[PDB]
Design a protein around this ligand. Structure first.
Ligand SMILES: Cc1ncc(COP(=O)(O)O)c(CNCCNC(=O)C[C@](O)(CC(=O)O)C(=O)O)c1O
Ligand SMILES: NCCNC(=O)C[C@](O)(CC(=O)O)C(=O)O
Lengths: 383, 383
């Protein structure tokens, strides 16, 4: 509340309707300074802009991170606004010929190759353009069947194919098995598996293990806001693992999105209407889940807080309820437009503002902005 | 495939990437002509543009339908380009003061009021502007959703509406069910709307001018041959108007899905084919951020396969036959799935997947800019 309330009160004082995204850039910079500086000298931090690729967010982040992790030519173009191509790293299971040629043309640092067929499509462009390209092979370790990377048993044949292509520079491997892990001790064991796997292929095939992309998937807790990822405990144990496994001459990198921008983002919206239907209570808010789809996608009740507005703009009384199971919804004409279902609300009124915390990662970026053609939420960036 | 194959062959012949929404406007016109002509003279068809508000689709639709059903200021704005204000009807659970003032200013045909507080906000705007407005009251007949007025509360809102001089109560709005495939069950629901609507008008002593019977006409995605029996529905619907003495009561539907579903196609080329831990995958251009319907509804979306004979690359295609295969897009999320473990007769890299019945809630519900991919090209077939 402390961060957003001065903004909400200004909007109320000016009679502007509250349907906003608010981002705390000071807290973002402070958070990034700590994370990147704690890392060892051989490890790097790339920002995965999937979580949030708003231009102001990238402007702020660029200074503190090594580079950007991108999943398309459009994300490359957004990254090139603030970083050189050789600090952009390109992953994804379906990179088109256009994207590969554009990536090669711009000269992106690495392409994280996810198949034998992709390798050959890339290599054909490299022979055509007469360029070379640093790559990692993305590996899918035996957890379940997904579309991502090379299946573990197929990896050997893709290594041998990449090594005999002179235009390909096989730096090493890319692992991204999990997303949203909250356990720091467990994440260290995932990294240990990556080191042992990467070293075994390097030793079997006899090529220099130059680089390992350890992926991302550093979790954010939406249920319990006090129990976040123990980054300091992780980093210090992660440092111990590097020296134990002798990975000091191997350059490492993470590609984090959610953990970097989640807690610094807020989706704030005014209460338009409160109603009781067949027993159940509902609070209808401005905007909707087409602007903030995270709770519907993940199927949880998103954490929020209620700013109690004291004035009344109408000549008639506000609708108020107290201590009821209340379902929070937007303006959409679908029953799926639900921020939170049957959650406790101590006091809520028409004219109050719901402050959804932890809205900065995969909030606006995953949302179906133009469904039912509502106007976009307004964007405020605090400095 | 007869409709889309000429377009696919043109794209391959021109060496353009295949990632397209293709629409059959000739088919759309024949569908509209069939529906609009078959209705009784006291009932009109409005198009609920949430399903598809593309300007070419609206232009084609506006020629045949009575008007547009809208649920935001943006949908009103789109509708006004092709219909006049007095053939636009406005619903939705969270109409803002700005949207209500806009609707009144433009002079919309009806506003479908969904609560007591909305009625009072509308009335306050009407007294300020010194205007009147025809309305219906949206009723929620006895499961709980956020929509309309709870049945027990209806009497109080009617009495409040009748006392307001600026409000002109035409009657009621019912939209209980969604995606119903049985014509006979829909007639019973329409009969139930008549019984309830008359009961309120006789009790409260005002003329029952209009009843909005909603949409909810289903489209079958599992079995394409077993669609909604419109001809069967309309004749029993005509019978019912006479039985319940509703010839002088003027009516309307508000259909979205049923109008545009079968005439739209989402067409995309196979970029990769891989095996991961025993399971086959086909990576397609675009993704569920362009066509979200399969993920939202959690089904295997119906499709056909166009085989392409030529090979643009000097290395071999990946070709499979008679395999259970998961179809995925370019996205970096494992939720990017068009269809899961579906038996495919034969497929190679460079072939084209043709997702049928992609015209309703395809592009319109999708998260277009997630991972910043370029939009698919839009073709509208007219000859
Ligand atoms: C008032 C009113 N009138 C008419 C209609 C149109 O109904 P019909 O098209 O069915 O005839 C609707 C449906 N309102 C839109 C219903 N939405 C959908 O069917 C798709 C989706 O929104 C997908 C998603 O967002 O995940 C969903 O909830 O499944 C409506 O709410
Ligand atoms: N699954 C863990 C990774 N989550 C995200 O990165 C967010 C999203 O991509 C957003 C979404 O498309 O629903 C998702 O897959 O839930």
């Amino acid at each position: 509340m402390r961060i957003v309330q001065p903004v909400i009160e200004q909007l109320k004082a000016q009679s502007h309707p509250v349907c906003h995204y608010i981002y705390d850039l000071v807290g973002l910079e402070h958070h990034l300074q700590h994370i990147t500086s704690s890392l060892p000298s051989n490890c790097q931090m790339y920002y995965a802009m999937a979580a949030n690729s708003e231009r102001t967010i990238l402007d702020t982040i660029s200074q503190y991170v090594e580079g950007f992790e991108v999943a398309s030519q459009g994300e490359i173009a957004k990254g090139l606004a603030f970083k050189p191509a050789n600090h952009i790293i390109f992953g994804g299971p379906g990179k088109t010929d256009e994207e590969l040629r554009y990536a090669v043309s711009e000269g992106v640092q690495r392409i994280h190759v996810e198949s034998m067929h992709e390798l050959q499509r890339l290599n054909a462009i490299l022979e055509d353009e007469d360029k070379t390209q640093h790559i990692l092979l993305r590996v899918n370790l035996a957890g379940r069947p997904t579309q991502f990377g090379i299946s573990e048993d197929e990896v050997d044949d893709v290594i041998e194919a990449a090594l005999v292509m002179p235009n390909i520079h096989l730096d090493g491997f890319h692992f991204h098995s999990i997303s949203n892990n909250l356990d720091s001790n467990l994440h260290v064991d995932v990294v240990k598996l990556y080191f042992k796997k990467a070293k075994s292929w390097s030793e079997k095939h006899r090529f220099p293990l130059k680089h390992i992309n350890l992926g991302g998937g550093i979790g954010v807790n939406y249920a319990d806001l006090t129990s976040q990822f123990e980054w300091d405990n992780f980093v210090e144990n992660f440092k111990t693992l590097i020296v134990e496994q002798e990975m000091e001459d191997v350059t490492l990198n993470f590609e984090c999105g959610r953990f970097i921008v989640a807690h610094i983002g807020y989706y704030v919206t005014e209460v338009l209407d409160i109603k009781k239907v067949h027993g159940a209570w509902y609070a209808i808010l401005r905007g909707g889940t087409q602007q903030f789809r995270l709770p519907v996608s993940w199927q949880h009740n998103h954490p929020f807080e209620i700013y109690r507005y004291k004035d009344n703009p109408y000549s008639f009384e506000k609708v108020s309820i107290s201590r009821q199971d209340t379902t929070l919804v937007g303006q959409l004409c679908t029953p799926k437009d639900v921020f939170a279902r049957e959650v406790q609300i101590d006091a809520i009124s028409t004219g109050d503002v719901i402050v959804f915390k932890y809205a900065g990662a995969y909030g606006w970026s995953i949302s179906h902005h133009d469904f039912l053609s509502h106007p976009h939420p307004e964007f405020i960036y605090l400095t």
